[PDB]
Amino acid sequence: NPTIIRARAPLRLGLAGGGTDVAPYADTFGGYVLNATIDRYAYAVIKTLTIPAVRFVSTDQQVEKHQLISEPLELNGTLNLHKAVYNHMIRNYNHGKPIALELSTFCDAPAGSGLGSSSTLVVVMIKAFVELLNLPLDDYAIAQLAYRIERVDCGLAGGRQDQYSATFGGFNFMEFYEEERTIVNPLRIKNWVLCELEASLVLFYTGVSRESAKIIQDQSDNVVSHKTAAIEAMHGIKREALVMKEALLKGDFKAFVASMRLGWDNKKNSARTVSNAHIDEIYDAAIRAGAQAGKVSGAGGGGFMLFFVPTEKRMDLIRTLGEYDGQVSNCHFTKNGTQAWRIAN
Amino acid sequence: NPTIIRARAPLRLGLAGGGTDVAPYADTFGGYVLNATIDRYAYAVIKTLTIPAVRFVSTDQQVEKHQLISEPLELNGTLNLHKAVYNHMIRNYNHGKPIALELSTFCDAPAGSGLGSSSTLVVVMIKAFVELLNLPLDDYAIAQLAYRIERVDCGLAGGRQDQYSATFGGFNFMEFYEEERTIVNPLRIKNWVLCELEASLVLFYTGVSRESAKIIQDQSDNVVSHKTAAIEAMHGIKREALVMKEALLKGDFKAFVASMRLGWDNKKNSARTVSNAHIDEIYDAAIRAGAQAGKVSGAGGGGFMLFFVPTEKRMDLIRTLGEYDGQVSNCHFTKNGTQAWRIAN
Ligand SMILES: [Cl-]
Ligand SMILES: [Cl-]
Ligand SMILES: [Cl-]
Ligand SMILES: [Cl-]
Ligand SMILES: [Cl-]
Ligand SMILES: [Cl-]
Ligand SMILES: [Cl-]
Ligand SMILES: [Cl-]
């Protein structure tokens, strides 16, 4: 009789500092990110099989099937992440002996949403295997493994914050240094501050961003090619992540919104495609309706936007955003990181 | 210097039994409802004023302003609920002496959403006053007061479940008897059951329902006018709420979905406008895409629908619903009831 495992990991809002976690910047100056997990999840399922095969199923429903071999699976460009997590687990915890199983994923947000889904999906696949094989991997180790699987094994360029939000959960201030050294600072925010923040945030999905890889490439180039003004914009991204972190610990909403405004300007100045005229139209309209600050959640170029609005103008802002292309949502934070459960055996 | 209070209360999904809480049925046979609060809120704010006036502001931004009188405010049909909560509090806890304040509300869902917003708004106004005046009102007393304010003071006909979900929070099985006697049974659902349920639910907002008052009138008439077959449909609504409650406590998803299917048929049979061809088109399409069961969340006729779908068909269902008019969402439950916090003094 088969075993069925599921795992989930929360997606995240980037509140401040995104862009300082790109490789050249973090390694050279040190990065800061402030982020927080929300009520939307990536999921992985492992089902053991009775036939001698391995099957991989993805969120946009790609599907690969292989027979049982004592060789690592080739990373041929179809479902490389699923195959790489599988390869790592078989090599390191099953003495290279294949396991007949189906590894499937799905997600509450599509690719390009600005919610860290790509890396959250790797975390959740790892967490399902942690449950399957009863592995003693702690949170730092799961997040580091996810990072290595995606960026080294699979050679995919990107940031360093999403692995940690998906694993740890809650509100975190992260410090990124050279040689893969990351410090996660879980923030002990007062209950009234959390309720006030949720009461003042409105989320707006603008559509799929296709700029992430480009923006991250540009931000990396800023440092490597010594683009002075753009590097200074990134230094401002960093400074404001710390100001925003302190504002939250102090329950200082005036400083929070001032820091989001300055941070949004810096983020736009760091890479050309972070914003565009369409996003700027939405932003301007939100501000007109009474929003005090806002930003694009991930690298930029589309995906989710978030707005800070005083409660007396919240419904006005909600009404206005209805006039634009996209979907409005409230913002609800989650405190828990990745978790797994069993359905059969 | 002024005082600023905010309160919030979670909205709810009706999982089973809705319709058995209408007055004639509950009073005659006893009602059962299974419901659960979600990650969307109604809000109230009280701001004390320095001028001698009282102001009321609503979710669709109606606004009323009065000067200070030692007479109860008239319920003239504009913002009656705000005025009635204010009248009750001034009479019973301030010896009839007016208080200069502004009472405002807003909500994460509009009227007719099938999420219990109308009554949740009354609860949250009450909770803001509990915080303002430091009242020792327990949960049963807040829910009962909300019920009386809406149905007696304001003479608005309706159900009995929403006041209790908004106040208590979490997953509750409620028993409704004659003479306003209600038993709330908070359900201790296992963590894996809650995660599995969220992983298997998809929400779909179909638009504003304008049928609530009609459906509740029809269900009440069923009992009063001895409409035999329609009363039997309501008896089936009741039976399946208990089966569904037991299925959740036992972690029995097969029984859960069987009970939702039988309960949806009964609900449709109890009142003519519970469903229509448009809702039925959506339902049929969801089932085609792989959903195993579903229903309209509130009284019926529109608002939110919820679907139970096995995880391997979840993305398919999500894609399909995209083809219809409405907005797809995941389902995240909240465990907490109504809560308040302070911003000034
Ligand atoms: Cl970000
Ligand atoms: Cl950011
Ligand atoms: Cl994303
Ligand atoms: Cl992202
Ligand atoms: Cl209901
Ligand atoms: Cl129901
Ligand atoms: Cl509603
Ligand atoms: Cl409702």
Author numbering:
A (entry chain B), B (entry chain B): 2 to 346
Which text from the study accompanies this structure?
Furthermore, soaking of native crystals with glycerol or mannose showed that these two sugars both bind in the sugar-phosphate binding pocket, where the sugar is expected. The glycerol and mannose complex crystals had a higher proportion of the monoclinic cell: these data could be processed, and the models refined well in both space groups. However, ligand electron density was significantly better in the orthorhombic space group for both of these complexes, and therefore all structures were refined in the orthorhombic cell.
Here, we present the structure of WcbL from Burkholderia pseudomallei. A critical step in the synthesis of heptoses is their 1-O phosphorylation, mediated by kinases such as HldE or WcbL. We report that WcbL operates through a sequential ordered Bi-Bi mechanism, loading the heptose first and then ATP. The protein forms a head-to-tail dimer, with the two active sites facing away from the dimer interface, in line with the native molecular weight predicted from size-exclusion chromatography.
